[PDB]
Amino acid sequence: STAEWWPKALNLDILSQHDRKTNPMGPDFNYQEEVQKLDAALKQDLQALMTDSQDWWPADWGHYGGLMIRLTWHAAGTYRIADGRGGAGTGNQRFAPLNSWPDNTNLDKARRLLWPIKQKYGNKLSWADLIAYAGTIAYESMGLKTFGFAFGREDIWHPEKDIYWGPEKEWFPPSTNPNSRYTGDRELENPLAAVTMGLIYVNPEGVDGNPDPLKTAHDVRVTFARMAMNDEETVALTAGGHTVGKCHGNGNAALLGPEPEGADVEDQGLGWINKTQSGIGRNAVTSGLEGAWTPHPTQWDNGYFAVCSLNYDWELKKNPAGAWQWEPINPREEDLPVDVEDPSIRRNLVMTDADMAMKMDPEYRKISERFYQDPAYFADVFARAWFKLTHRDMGPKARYIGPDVPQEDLIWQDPIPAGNRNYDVQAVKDRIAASGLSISELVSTAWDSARTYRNSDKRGGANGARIRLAPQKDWEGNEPDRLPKVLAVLEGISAATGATVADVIVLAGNVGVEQKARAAGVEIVLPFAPGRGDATAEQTDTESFAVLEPIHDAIATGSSRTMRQRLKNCCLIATQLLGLTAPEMTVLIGGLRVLGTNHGGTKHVVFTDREGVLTNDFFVNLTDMNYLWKPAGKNLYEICDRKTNQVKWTATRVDLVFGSNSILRAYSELYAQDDNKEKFVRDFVAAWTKVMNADRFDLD
Amino acid sequence: STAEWWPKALNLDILSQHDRKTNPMGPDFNYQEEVQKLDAALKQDLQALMTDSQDWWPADWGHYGGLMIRLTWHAAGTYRIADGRGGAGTGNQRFAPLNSWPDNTNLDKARRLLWPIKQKYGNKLSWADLIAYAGTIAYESMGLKTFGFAFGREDIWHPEKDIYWGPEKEWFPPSTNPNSRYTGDRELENPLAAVTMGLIYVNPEGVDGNPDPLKTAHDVRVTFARMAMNDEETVALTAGGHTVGKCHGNGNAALLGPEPEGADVEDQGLGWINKTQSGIGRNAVTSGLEGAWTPHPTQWDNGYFAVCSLNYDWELKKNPAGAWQWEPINPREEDLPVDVEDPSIRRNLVMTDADMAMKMDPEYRKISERFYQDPAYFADVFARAWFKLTHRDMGPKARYIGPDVPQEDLIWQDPIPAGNRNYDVQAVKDRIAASGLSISELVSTAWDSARTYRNSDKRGGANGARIRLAPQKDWEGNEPDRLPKVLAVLEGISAATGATVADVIVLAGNVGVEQKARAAGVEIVLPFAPGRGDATAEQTDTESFAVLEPIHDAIATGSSRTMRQRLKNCCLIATQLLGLTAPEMTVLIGGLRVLGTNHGGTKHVVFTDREGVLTNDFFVNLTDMNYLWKPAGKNLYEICDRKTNQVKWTATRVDLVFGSNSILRAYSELYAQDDNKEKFVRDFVAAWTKVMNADRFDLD
Ligand code: HEM
Ligand code: HEM
Incomplete structure (x- = not known):
């Protein structure tokens, strides 16, 4: 298209997302006021969905809770503290690329299963809230006292173009490859909160697919911290999450069709569909691992640490689809999870490398022990952490709406x-x-x-x-x-x-x-x-x-230290977070400059003989060809008079990009017009x- | 970014261009009414600019007319009849990728030279009109009776994403390469109206750089026809265009800096800047050819055919920058164009391969002859063609505004x-x-x-x-x-x-x-x-x-014949031309389908038990998972009931893409809501x- 030609150019389009032409709602539509009218006692329908199995994607043991909790967890698991991007606050999992990440395999089924409810409640229930609420109601139905929930997440209509997901141009590649997000000694590229592309937090089979619970524990601690979770919240989340549901890997994976965005129209927007053989029920293949963490995966209980991860010893095994997984040594029959279609058949228990890390890492082990001997604490810490997970990108409580918003x-x-x-x-x-x-x-x-x-x-x-x-x-x-x-x-x-x-x-x-x-x-x-x-x-x-x-x-032409990122790159990212458009970014820069607001009182782009006076002088002078721009060191230029060859002003790249970038200069020219x-x-x-x-x- | 992952996906963004967040003008701003207030007797300023040489890019012989005419010609030369895309109607030359095409080398200087005027007239004079008017006033100042001019072209603020410029991922490559726009025996890929990427119509040195005026004549006839110009208009345009100005190629090209989009901020948005040696005046390098077609290039006259192309014989030569060009045999001194800085020095005449084609091609030769012996006709045919060139994408005369709109x-x-x-x-x-x-x-x-x-x-x-x-x-x-x-x-x-x-x-x-x-x-x-x-x-x-x-x-699920293009690709292109957004395209398809409007009375996506009744039945049924979609031949699917395994409806890709594409299905789901x-x-x-x-x- 119009530009693979100049890949170094500012991606200004991230400043013009979610505009009128993509939004299908009337311009006066206001979700906050429509959701306040929602009959939240919709809890009955969501709870009923949990045991309302559909033929095209049957519920394990007749209960979708495990699946739904994973849905919410994954919708939430994309958040990262460095820039606050990712998270469940916009319902982004229903769009590319998240709807087609390997880690989100079969969550397309989960989302689709929620559609009848979205159809029923309409404009008063956004896909974002519904996806974020699903796992909470699932937990409620399975026995967990959840901490609360708030509606208020407005829907989006296309991918969030502003989120940089990683440098890889391949899915889930080894960390020892070109375009790697790893540097020095396993030092994760800063913004990122996942170990590879297409995964939420960590590799379940081990670092780069090689099982060791101790090195896996390091990735778990690092990624979860980048998502705002400490050791306690992490052990809590992991155990609480795997207290229900299971892993699916009973089949050849290679038989799975294309992920959603790569599937053809006959797949109804779904993906990872097996057309060679049965790919549903006990024949389901998702992560590739197979088995359940607890004897009773349809119910909240103390089975995760309770004879399973702590009381049985575990060894490496390979599941039917070729994935590494840990299984228990000499498990008793009553502790074996039953088959998802026929209760009279017994299947196997499992633990991922991340679960074993909770037992092997010295620090997680102590927390695991506390939750084993004090389940009331476990349930409270998990419930709170589950709530934090689903609202850490909701912002001020003022945005929270609904009957179950915690008073705390x-x-x-x-x-x-x-x-x-x-x-x-x-x-x-x-x-x-x-x-x-x-x-x-x-x-x-x-x-x-x-x-x-x-x-x-x-x-x-x-x-x-x-x-x-x-x-x-x-x-x-x-x-x-x-x-x-x-x-x-x-x-x-x-x-x-x-x-x-x-x-x-x-x-x-x-x-x-x-x-x-x-x-x-x-x-x-x-x-x-x-x-x-x-x-x-x-x-x-x-x-x-x-x-x-x-x-x-850049709005105050300040850079704390030399950074890899271009100054205008940094400028563009702050303005995207601020919610400003390109035209808005442009006038702001022009105004602040003549108001004499640079950090350190520098004159880098003042371009006025009258600081403190709100004029369009920045643009008039930036756009004046009687001057030439001479590079003059790091992030600095000399604005010289072409006749006298003397230095009139100095300026940085943040200043001059507004007179270089074709789109920004068009804006600069507009504001430099006599009228x-x-x-x-x-x-x-x-x-x-x-x-x-x-x-x-x-x-x- | 968010998708190199699935390159086969619909480029829905072309339907959401030129929206509020990119437009810097207030929402009630109306150009048609502001330009009607313009003091068109601005003709005096534009005419004065022609002889107002600026140091950073001096005017040849103190006259910018040749440069300005080329500006307008190139702004206009991008138009193509197949889809009506390209042209001077939006001022697109000030944006990527056109501002950086090899053929537009140094036109960045021309545009920049027009800025003081744009600054003076402001919101009442769009960059689009100014660029389109420049060459007309230049012709007037040089002696040609122009046919007329109309204002009314509204400015854009970013590249026209909807225009497919060609398949090449390199600039001006040979036609005998991978990703070629040529097939069979020099059969130009249909939409396209240029022989290669980055060029307006034809290669000036010959087909793929090899001089022969007869094969060049074939490309000229083909490309100009794809721009709505016949033989007469073409010879007229070529001769009339080259009656003034010259070719610039006095230097090493390799010394030219990056084109605009690839230049760094110090270049003020300009490009092709020579910093190794002088690159202005007589040292200017643009196309690479060097010389003028006529003795008096600052004035309209009969010099093009008048001793030059018809009366002198021509031979192949190489200019200082290594480009093929035709020069005359034993030209008299008075016929030699003088140096652009010093009138006392004589330089050389030239003819490009396209000019020689006007003499060598049997049919052009006859027209050339008529213009040689009947200059009144030449000037009239050229003037009219110049006007057609600059307004062929203006639409109905109702859009034309200004004192010089022809009554005809x-x-x-x-x-x-x-x-x-x-x-x-x-x-x-x-x-x-x-x-x-x-x-x-x-x-x-x-x-x-x-x-x-x-x-x-x-x-x-x-x-x-x-x-x-x-x-x-x-x-x-x-x-x-x-x-x-x-x-x-x-x-x-x-x-x-x-x-x-x-x-x-x-x-x-x-x-x-x-x-x-x-x-x-x-x-x-x-x-x-x-x-x-x-x-x-x-x-x-x-x-x-x-x-x-x-x-x-697609709006009436009609396809005349099997086409290379996907049906939804075709659907997307018609809706972009129609000026419709994705949400608009979506409701239209859903509505027309239940109104029973398919071509041939086909039921391909009726999905209603009640045709002729305006309901949201298309969406309710398309979004219903109780059905599965089975591919059933060319552009056809069977919508089957999952319980009974029977065929309920049929549908095409145009229908099902609304239930497959993640963005379109989100719209479909909205319209399928109970509310x-x-x-x-x-x-x-x-x-x-x-x-x-x-x-x-x-x-x-
Ligand atoms: C600590 C890092 C984690 C890793 C490496 C991990 C890994 C996995 C894997 C590989 C599966 C396979 C699912 C399938 O094949 O269908 C799974 C399922 C699941 N995980 Fe995690 N998980 C982690 C954290 C969590 C957390 C924190 C929770 C939520 C608090 C959670 C909740 C679930 C649930 C509910 C399922 C069940 C899916 C179903 O039954 O359909 N996981 N997890
Ligand atoms: C018929 C196909 C054509 C070809 C192959 C062609 C080729 C060229 C080339 C190679 C240059 C070199 C300019 C430079 O190096 O600076 C040039 C200049 C120019 N052409 Fe064409 N041209 C064509 C048609 C036209 C037409 C139809 C017009 C307008 C009616 C036109 C008007 C001009 C003008 C005014 C210049 C002068 C630029 C200056 O003096 O700065 N050309 N053309």
């Missing part, structure tokens, strides 16, 4: 109280104006408070005013000395008024922008919404926030507002 | 008169209802009248009611016997009322749809706009309309309306 404020939700809304905004502004804070100090501070937001998992943002807290107040990119000079003033204004520090930091930014538009002879009142609360250090997980540190921010001065200001303001209000889910 | 109605515009608007719509409807025409006969006829439309060059559509004319009335896909049974009735209703046959065919379709919604117990009045005119056979070019023949239409019956009807209607009104540029 969990730390991973980034709890923030409602701030006072009755306080007279204008008095707050006058006191801000009346302080000796520069237009520049006002804007940078507000920018920094809001820039932490990312729509991937909805964490960050200006609401709870955390920047004032550790570790944020000390982040290099946040300019710690200038930040307190400003917090000191603003904290005083808030105590003196009834407005929150969070509301004040934003309102101050708004003042800086208002002062700058006024200096260019433009009068404007920037929209504003009170209500931000101030969050406490107690409800702020210092370790989980490390991931939101601004190590890079678009007011449009630039109006558009800068709207984008500014969008950023300050991005995390405002507390609003209606 | 040119045949290639598909002229259609204004039809009467005062006639009482309801009386027309009652008479239609009162006829014995089936709901099916009404809908299919209207569909067929409107389906010919394509937004690529804005030709086709229900307005002028041509379907009633040759060759349309006899096209197989239009079902000639059923079409006249319906025209006979409808032609009578129109004569009896004051409404046009065109308005009547559409209104009839609207009645069929209204009758079908009524049968499903839904009352609706479909929007309607009177005014369509009936076009005459005299103003209808039977040969130019061949290209709009519906050889395929979306009315949404389906409302959405089907809106899409129906959009199609019936697509060519209505005559409306405000």
